[PDB]
């Protein structure tokens, strides 16, 4: 008669895209819509029990999150888990929920290894995966003539969730699964000046198609140095792997978009360099229901959660939690509709998998592996104002690249440069 | 009045050096000696509650073990954990026991990261560590004139505990912590012929002082190929990182020792190549109490555990569990003796740390980091019979190499070859 949903997310730290101050109101909105719908779990009272994935310091932890999961499993015996979003939190929790045979739902945990559903059984990912970024890069190379060599630089450390490592891992493995071209990869430490001679030297010895996962400021410093070193768009192309658009403002206002602008004196130099730079991001949901959701999410987060939800691509995470939760209730409803129960994790999970669905994020497809197909945008400046705009979109389900607002991928030469130079890299 | 000891080890699989069929009888012997001693925990009845680190397939698990730990912590509220020995089992459990402020004791879990006791608080390691292998390699290079270049090949995969990876990681980090010479490292898959041209090529391009962590058969094949390709002891030296002496028999009988012998036709050629090869192992405890312990462990394992404990270096693990346990009861006894209690993990732990002790393994030192100093032997053939024997010993607490039975490190040239060739490797 009631269905208990265990949540393991950052319940106090509001810095994460999957923070509760931001996923909480989305989930409250979702539950409110289940009530209104007499076709979704009629009469049931969906209950939410919460546990925090964060440690004493407040960051998501490989230890707090699995402990909180066991605590919720024995205190409340839930039918489904929501979260965690951090990779290091989700991997032990996901391994517990697989052993318990309890379905797990998350719009985070994009790492390559959570992709191994034979281990992460009954884990359904309704947000982005990093292998999906490999899909985009693949379609990008095929649809542009780079069949040989690419270089990948990624900032990395220990102490955070190593997001650039897991992004790059996903790109690297999926790209070599599909193209099997030569992809070099080097890890640098952002705050260490020692690494920037090494990087620049690699940029010119290891590739012309170059992908950088890093903070906006580091990507900007590498562009300024590449310019300073005579590395121009007639021969190089630098993709900033900035999936949440940290280097850009909000797509709702803030017209136009100038990531090279910093007010530091180099804004002229930086815009010259950024002519060779393109920015890869997640795609902003374009459908009208997304904008209505944002308005309601902001209202609910300010009122019941004392949090101010700002615009930006990070909001696709709470939107995807919202949509994934509804997708689950539909599966449970259909499962009950054929004699099943709310604890038939396998039946419920297969109803969600290899299925298309309509949510506040618009079209969303769960693939056969149980991971949502992820759409991507490609930004580019026109030489006119130097402002960056979406010129290409990638539909993750059909694997198609389509031009945007009749824009063209700006090339300093007129066409893309080749991944190998005229002679060798030597 | 009674002290609950929680155990998380492989309770059913007997393949592991820390398997319960082997650590069980050692711990039972230890508890019997606590009884007999009116100076250790007088009148207390020490209780053992067991949980299995192993999964459905029977191998030690990053999931079964932390689940087993939580189960024991809430059902029995123990004062101390024993095990796990597997690295992937011991890392989640060690993070749990640090959070619970419960002391953890293990003669396994030698990985570099377990050494970070700010994370693995109250974890005391009474068996070998892989940073201690770095100490030995350092003392070996200093005491032999190799201050430049070394190459490390290690057989690695996914699916097991990746023991060669963690062995090599510890060697690599500690050696560059102390010598900061150039250490190249390449990983191969043992059953894949693709890698052997790659390995041989690296052997001749990347080092003359070469460490191989691998199965005995792989290490033998590499020597046969090195010989076949003109790589002799006048210019190369191959150390097999074989800590448990898998390539050798038992030090009690089986006189003498011929790792190159296989009865396969190549025994003549293999002995030629093995002249260039030396074998690094853990040191067999030499004290008489160790041999008495073996006799009793063997009896107890056959009678109460239906297991047959064969001779070999793997027995230092249950011997070290035995000694670590008594070391702990001493500390608990001293802690009670100054007003403390059996739940004062910090006080108990600091009593065990930076302390020397006498056990069935003989002299054993827990360093300031809470890890036992590890003694290493070095095997070498004399050209006479081609049999390998200990010729050098390493005392991890004094960090000393001392010649063994007046033997000398056999060199085909008369002295060790230089880590760099006459010209460059080119």
């Amino acid at each position: 008669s009631d269905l208990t949903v265990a949540v393991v997310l950052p319940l106090t730290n509001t810095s994460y895209p999957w923070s509760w101050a931001r996923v909480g109101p989305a989930v409250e909105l979702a539950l409110a819509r289940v009530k209104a719908r007499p076709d979704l779990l009629p009469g049931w009272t969906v209950r939410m029990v919460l546990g925090s994935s964060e440690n004493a310091a407040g960051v998501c932890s490989d230890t707090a999150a699995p402990l909180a999961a066991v605590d919720l499993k024995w205190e409340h015996s839930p039918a489904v888990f929501l979260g965690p979003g951090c990779v290091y939190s989700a991997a032990p929790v996901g391994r517990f929920t697989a052993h318990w045979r309890v379905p797990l739902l998350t719009a985070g945990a994009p790492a390559l290894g959570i992709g191994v559903k034979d281990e992460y059984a009954l884990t359904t990912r309704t947000g982005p995966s990093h292998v999906k970024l490999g899909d985009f890069v693949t379609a990008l190379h095929r649809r542009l003539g780079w069949e040989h060599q690419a270089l990948v630089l990624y900032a990395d450390r220990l102490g955070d969730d190593r997001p650039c490592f897991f992004i790059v891992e996903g790109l690297y493995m999926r790209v070599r699964e599909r193209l099997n071209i030569t992809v070099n990869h080097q890890e640098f430490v952002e705050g260490d000046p020692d690494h920037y001679p090494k990087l620049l030297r690699a940029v010119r010895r290891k590739g012309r198609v170059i992908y950088i996962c890093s903070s906006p400021d580091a990507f900007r410093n590498l562009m300024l140095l590449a310019l300073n070193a005579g590395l121009t768009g007639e021969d190089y192309v630098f993709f900033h792997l900035d999936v949440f658009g940290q280097s850009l403002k909000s797509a709702q206002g803030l017209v136009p978009q100038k990531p090279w602008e910093r007010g530091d004196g180099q804004d002229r130099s930086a815009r010259q360099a950024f002519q060779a730079a393109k920015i890869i991001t997640y795609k902003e949901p374009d459908n009208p229901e997304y904008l209505e959701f944002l308005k309601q999410l902001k209202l609910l987060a300010d009122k019941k959660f004392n949090f101010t939800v700002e615009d930006g691509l990070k909001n696709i995470i709470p939107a995807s939690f919202h949509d994934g939760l509804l997708l689950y209730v539909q599966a449970v409803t259909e499962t009950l509709a054929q004699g099943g129960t709310v604890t038939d994790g396998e039946n419920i999970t297969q109803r969600m998998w290899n299925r298309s669905f309509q949510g506040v994020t618009g079209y969303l497809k769960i693939d056969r592996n149980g991971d949502r197909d992820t759409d991507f945008s490609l930004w580019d400046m026109d030489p006119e104002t130097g402002a960056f705009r979406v010129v290409l979109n990638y539909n993750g389900t059909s694997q198609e690249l389509m031009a945007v607002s009749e824009h063209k991928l700006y090339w300093p030469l007129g066409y893309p440069p080749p991944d190998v130079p005229k002679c060798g890299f030597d | 009045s009674d002290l609950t000891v929680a155990v998380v080890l492989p309770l059913t699989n007997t393949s592991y050096p820390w398997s319960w069929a082997r650590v069980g009888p050692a711990v039972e012997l230890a508890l019997a000696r606590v009884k007999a001693r009116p100076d250790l925990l007088p009148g207390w009845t020490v209780r053992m509650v067991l949980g299995s680190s192993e999964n459905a397939a029977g191998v030690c698990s990053d999931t079964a073990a932390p689940l087993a730990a939580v189960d024991l912590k809430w059902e029995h509220s123990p004062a101390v954990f024993l095990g796990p020995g597997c690295v992937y089992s011991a890392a989640p459990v060690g993070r749990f026991t640090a959070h619970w402020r419960v002391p953890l004791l293990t003669a396994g879990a030698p990985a570099l990261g377990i050494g970070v006791k700010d994370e693995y608080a109250l974890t005391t390691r009474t068996g070998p560590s892989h940073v201690k292998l770095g100490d030995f390699v350092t003392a070996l290079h200093r005491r032999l004139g190799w201050e430049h270049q070394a190459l490390v090949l290690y057989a690695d995969r996914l699916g097991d505990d990746r023991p060669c990876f963690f062995i090599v990681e510890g060697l690599y980090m500690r050696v560059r912590e102390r010598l900061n010479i150039t250490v190249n490292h390449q990983e191969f898959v043992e059953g894949d012929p693709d890698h052997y041209p790659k390995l041989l090529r690296a052997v001749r391009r990347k080092g003359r002082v070469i460490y191989i962590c691998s199965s005995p058969d792989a290490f033998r094949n590499l020597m046969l190929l090195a010989l076949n390709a003109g790589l002799t002891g006048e210019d190369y030296v191959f150390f097999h990182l074989d800590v448990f002496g898998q390539s050798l028999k038992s030090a009690q009988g089986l006189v003498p020792q011929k790792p190159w012998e296989r009865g396969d036709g190549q025994d003549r050629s293999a002995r030629q190549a093995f002249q260039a090869a030396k074998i690094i192992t853990y040191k067999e405890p030499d004290n008489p109490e160790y041999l008495e312990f073996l006799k009793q462990l063997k009896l107890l394992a056959d009678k109460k555990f239906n297991f047959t404990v064969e001779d070999g270096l793997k027995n230092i693990i249950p011997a070290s569990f035995h000694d670590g346990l008594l070391l702990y009861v001493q500390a608990v006894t001293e802690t009670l003796a100054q007003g403390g209690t059996v739940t004062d993990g910090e006080n108990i732990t600091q009593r065990m740390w930076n302390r020397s002790f006498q056990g069935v393994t003989g002299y054993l030192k827990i360093d300031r980091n809470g890890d036992r100093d590890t003694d290493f032997s070095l095997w070498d053939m004399d050209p006479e019979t081609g049999a390998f024997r200990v010729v050098l010993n390493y005392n991890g607490t004094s960090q000393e190499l001392m010649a063994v039975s007046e033997h000398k490190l056999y060199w085909p040239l008369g002295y060790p070859p230089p880590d760099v060739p006459k010209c460059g490797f080119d």
Partner: peptide
């Protein structure tokens, strides 16, 4: 994505990234 690699695909635990041995990098603790 069950392909083998020296750096990528090696479980998710901070124990496998204490040294980034098999991973080309420029750092260490």
């Amino acid at each position: 994505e069950v392909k083998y690699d020296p750096c990528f695909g090696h479980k998710i635990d901070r124990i496998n990234h204490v040294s980034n041995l098999g991973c080309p990098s420029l750092r260490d603790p």
